[PDB]
Amino acid sequence: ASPFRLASAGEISEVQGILRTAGLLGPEKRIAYLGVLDPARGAGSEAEDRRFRVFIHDVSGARPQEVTVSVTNGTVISAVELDTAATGELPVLEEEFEVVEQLLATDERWLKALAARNLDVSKVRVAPLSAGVFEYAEERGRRILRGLAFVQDFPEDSAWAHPVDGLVAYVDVVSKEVTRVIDTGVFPVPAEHGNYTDPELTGPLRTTQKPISITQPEGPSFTVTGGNHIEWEKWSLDVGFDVREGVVLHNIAFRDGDRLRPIINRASIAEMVVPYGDPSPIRSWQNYFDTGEYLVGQYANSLELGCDCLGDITYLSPVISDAFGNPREIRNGICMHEEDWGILAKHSDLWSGINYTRRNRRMVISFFTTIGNYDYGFYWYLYLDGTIEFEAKATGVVFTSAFPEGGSDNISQLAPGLGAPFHQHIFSARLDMAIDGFTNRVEEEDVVRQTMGPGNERGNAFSRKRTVLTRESEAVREADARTGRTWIISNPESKNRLNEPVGYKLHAHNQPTLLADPGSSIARRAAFATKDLWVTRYADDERYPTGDFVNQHSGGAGLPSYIAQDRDIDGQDIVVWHTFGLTHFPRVEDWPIMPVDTVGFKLRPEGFFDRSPVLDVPAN
Amino acid sequence: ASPFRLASAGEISEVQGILRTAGLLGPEKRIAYLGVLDPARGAGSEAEDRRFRVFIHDVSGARPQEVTVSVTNGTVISAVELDTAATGELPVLEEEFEVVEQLLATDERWLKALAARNLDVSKVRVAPLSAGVFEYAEERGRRILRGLAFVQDFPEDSAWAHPVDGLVAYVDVVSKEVTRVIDTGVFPVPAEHGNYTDPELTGPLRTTQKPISITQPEGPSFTVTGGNHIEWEKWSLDVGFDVREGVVLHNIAFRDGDRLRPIINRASIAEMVVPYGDPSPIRSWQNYFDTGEYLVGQYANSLELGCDCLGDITYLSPVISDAFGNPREIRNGICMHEEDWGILAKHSDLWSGINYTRRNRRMVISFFTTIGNYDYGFYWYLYLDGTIEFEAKATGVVFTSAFPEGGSDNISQLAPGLGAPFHQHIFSARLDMAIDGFTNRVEEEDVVRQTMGPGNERGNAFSRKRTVLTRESEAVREADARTGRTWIISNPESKNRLNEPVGYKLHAHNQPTLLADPGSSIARRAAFATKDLWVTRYADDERYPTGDFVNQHSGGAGLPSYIAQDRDIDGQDIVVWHTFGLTHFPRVEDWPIMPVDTVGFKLRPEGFFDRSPVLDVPAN
Numbered sequence A, B: 001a002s003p004f005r006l007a008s009a010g011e012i013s014e015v016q017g018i019l020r021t022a023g024l025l026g027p028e029k030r031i032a033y034l035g036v037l038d039p040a041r042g043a044g045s046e047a048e049d050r051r052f053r054v055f056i057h058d059v060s061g062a063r064p065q066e067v068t069v070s071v072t073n074g075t076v077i078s079a080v081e082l083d084t085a086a087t088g089e090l091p092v093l094e095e096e097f098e099v100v101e102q103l104l105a106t107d108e109r110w111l112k113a114l115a116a117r118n119l120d121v122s123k124v125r126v127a128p129l130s131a132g133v134f135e136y137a138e139e140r141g142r143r144i145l146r147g148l149a150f151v152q153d154f155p156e157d158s159a160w161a162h163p164v165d166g167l168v169a170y171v172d173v174v175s176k177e178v179t180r181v182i183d184t185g186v187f188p189v190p191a192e193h194g195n196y197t198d199p200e201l202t203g204p205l206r207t208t209q210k211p212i213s214i215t216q217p218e219g220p221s222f223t224v225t226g227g228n229h230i231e232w233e234k235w236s237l238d239v240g241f242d243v244r245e246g247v248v249l250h251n252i253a254f255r256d257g258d259r260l261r262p263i264i265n266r267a268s269i270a271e272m273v274v275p276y277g278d279p280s281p282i283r284s285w286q287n288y289f290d291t292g293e294y295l296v297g298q299y300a301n302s303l304e305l306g307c308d309c310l311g312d313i314t315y316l317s318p319v320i321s322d323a324f325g326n327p328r329e330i331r332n333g334i335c336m337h338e339e340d341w342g343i344l345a346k347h348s349d350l351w352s353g354i355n356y357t358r359r360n361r362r363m364v365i366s367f368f369t370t371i372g373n374y375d376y377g378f379y380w381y382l383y384l385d386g387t388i389e390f391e392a393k394a395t396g397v398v399f400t401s402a403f404p405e406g407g408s409d410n411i412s413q414l415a416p417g418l419g420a421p422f423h424q425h426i427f428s429a430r431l432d433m434a435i436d437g438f439t440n441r442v443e444e445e446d447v448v449r450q451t452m453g454p455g456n457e458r459g460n461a462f463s464r465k466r467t468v469l470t471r472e473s474e475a476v477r478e479a480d481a482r483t484g485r486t487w488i489i490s491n492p493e494s495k496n497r498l499n500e501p502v503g504y505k506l507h508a509h510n511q512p513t514l515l516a517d518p519g520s521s522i523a524r525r526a527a528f529a530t531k532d533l534w535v536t537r538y539a540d541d542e543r544y545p546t547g548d549f550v551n552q553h554s555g556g557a558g559l560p561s562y563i564a565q566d567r568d569i570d571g572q573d574i575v576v577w578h579t580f581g582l583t584h585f586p587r588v589e590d591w592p593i594m595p596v597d598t599v600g601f602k603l604r605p606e607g608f609f610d611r612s613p614v615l616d617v618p619a620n
């Protein structure tokens, strides 16, 4: 009954039939993206219309199309042909990944490069990577992937240990042509293996770890209704899943007495970029937009009980479309559980004689994705005290290169002859705010130091200042950890019992933002990543910080274009976009498989409640 | 047998007898501090000598003494009379806290102030607070406490809800004189109660939380031998306890193959200061040195199974001295357990077909202390992958004041008429480093941005730079979150298999440091807190960043004095001192009892190992 329910297999099958009958899904067509559209603002008329947005690619070279379909009515709402040299190419298809290695295997230039290195072409894996936009005029309007080669010594070998440096190829995956093969010189292929399940590398496995058993003898404290509606410890929300963004949280609200109070209308990771900092021409083009170019949701893992998710786990199994419009279930793709989280509040009072301890817990919603060598976990946490937190977990195998004789300023050495280029992993969280409703505003809060003098004779005072962001042109903000900078999202029309506007404070980790030169291609295509915080006025079509069509888009799309409208954001329907990321200088300990590292952000209540919201937690 | 074993009740009883027989523990004497001295550098001669350091106060006004005793030999090693106007007063005694309220109850000025406010003196609690050093010349060389008043409506009432603003008194606790009573005007006493166990404030307790059961059916994976020696998942360490510092970690080492590799010789929180930022003369003197003035170990809580520590818990019960030299056990004062910690490493490889997941865990060592209204948890964590982390948890009841009509730049409003002054909680971690032995050095690592141009034609490259700190005068460092600044502690004489020096990287949270004017009394007494990182050359007597005698010391003791020696720290026995803290602008949600907030730091291996140290973790 809920408009925010997950897409069903039946809905996707109906979309396929509607597209086929309309003549839009012939044998040459591929679905590059399919997802449900959110209800438009003002759905308080019960007139639900389940609409789907579809990107249709054509493998014969005809123009792709963007199509909107109503499964409720069984109709095509609109269908637009796309000029991809103007607005960008469609996301990469899973089936194009295979084309790259097969095409290169028959190319004379590729074979002569492998022959010079005495490599058997049957053992050479090619990583198919997105192209970006650089100096190659012949690439405008064509679908290009670039390939980097790795040697697999046997079928279960980790090819990442054996990069073939000095060699790169570019491939037109529609015309099936190899456009360029660049060979800058022979580097030795690193010889040590990286097989982290091989007993001679691991040694004998430890026998010292005793089991930890986490159970819930009465079941979990949360309920799931309507497939994806969660109620847990006064929280209420809907768990969505989109093939591009992955897990999306809708309608995050908190039950305060008999009032259901909204906090966040929609929360998602709306882009993530992985730029490489190696100036070698073999890799200086390398930038992954995992969300916008590859679609992180379609590579979500099936999560295993006891290994990936431990405890009393409730699973969701979202359904997505394959490239032909058939529904595909991602079995056990989302884990949901609660976790003990230590002490919530504690005080032993000498005067009253009362000793008081309460324990905290959090609700966890998570999925894991694998894009080539990298694996990312996305974790959303809700806490008893009203805190909302996101955490990204990065693991997998680092991308490798040769390590040059005589060292490098831009590459770490991991093993003899084996290097790992410097890079970043940068995320954009899109937070469509609804603090007690939709009239919100953002204030920037800095600590204020005071000078010793009149009215501060002992030089101990310090204060804070808040600056309201009133227009989009002034709402592009930088972190300042030294001044304790945070941002408060408040509702100026909703007051707590002290007559102060209710609010939530965003605490950033204050990690470095995009390091590339501001004149670079990546700085233009990932402009969101150059600043810590952006605030826009909500609009239906402003969904991604990088635009709708990220693949091979020349630049400037998304946030820099949106904020040029300079709209009023002072007590309006607003969206916060927070950039955060990891700067990765690989260490020896990251090899041959990397222990998890993390980054994230959190939001804490700031006068949202009239007192602590966890006074009614029992003693346990 | 180990020299690092905890003090026994028998040792403390022997110290008492040795002091008594030597004529140093008559009826007028009080022990203000007692603790075991660590072995001096070079204990590889098996000639153990258990020595104790004792601060002896005299309640008749005679000079206090510092005494060192050998329990091994049964002798007084040295005894020095202290000139407290020069070197500082002894720590505050628990028994002096009671003196303040009792003395004020008979003072004519105090009674007339309470009469003007129609307060019954029997209901007025006085918080006895350390004095600092300000403008009062008569306080030099005297033991002073300052008192602030709160009303307790009935014996189980939370007095913190009822501050009596506009009134402060100073008391000489040795001569038993009230030196000054300052009344700056009548403020209404806030009337709402703050009783967080009262059903009419909490409402009905939730019935929605289902149990989480954490058990270890085969017992824990760590072993405890010799009372306090821990072995866990290749880690080896000794857990100490000192009445001033609390939990101290000794001899932190990691078993790498058949080599036991040292990492940290001694880790402790060696000071913690809580400065208040309210310029009102009622509170502008208020600064707690919880470690140096009050001694956090002596107020450690007895931790309850299932409430404070959940799971399969192993307890330590440290023994301390009371003020008369009798041993006192802090039952269940230290909790030790392991915790599941999510995914350690994960990769699903398309080419090899291998799916790999491993889970992480951490070892937890924790204690909790209560100093008046505040309660602090101290948590040390050891992880499978070699990471060491500290986390402080702050909870309890915020210190309150009146909220002035017309608002304040330095006080938050929590309830009608009830304010909470701004303040910080700042910690100093003292890390006596021993990375693969004692020849260590510190490098500061910044990210380096590169300009687009020759050798970086696409403007994507970025790098890093490391600066060796060679002398103490250049080893006082500030955070810079924007440049990703971290510090690496390395051993230049111990190389990994790539011929790089082994090392560990310190990751700070980059929170603001001390905000007070640099010319203030607190900036002089807590100079450590004005900078994020200090490195000194190890010396036996340089124990605390604030000096040995913090109470009423005029300033400049500790780190600023140590580093003036300008000693060589490049490949030497060095000590890292890291300042970190919380800046607290109280929110409504902090009242009437504050949910936990946290701050800390961590150290991660940086080429310490030759590859990932967790390849031998089994599948579980």
Ligand SMILES: [Cu+2]
Pocket (backbone or CB within 6 Å): A394, A398, A423, A424, A425, A584
């Ligand atoms: Cu990385």
Ligand SMILES: [Cu+2]
Pocket (backbone or CB within 6 Å): B394, B398, B423, B424, B425, B584
């Ligand atoms: Cu505080």
Ligand code: NA
Pocket (backbone or CB within 6 Å): A085, A086, A087, A088, A553, A554, A555
């Ligand atoms: Na264009």
Ligand code: NA
Pocket (backbone or CB within 6 Å): A265, A432, A433, A434, A438, A538, A572, A573, A574, A575
């Ligand atoms: Na909004």
Ligand code: NA
Pocket (backbone or CB within 6 Å): B085, B086, B087, B088, B553, B554, B555
């Ligand atoms: Na002095």
Ligand code: NA
Pocket (backbone or CB within 6 Å): B265, B432, B433, B434, B438, B538, B572, B573, B574, B575
């Ligand atoms: Na050292």
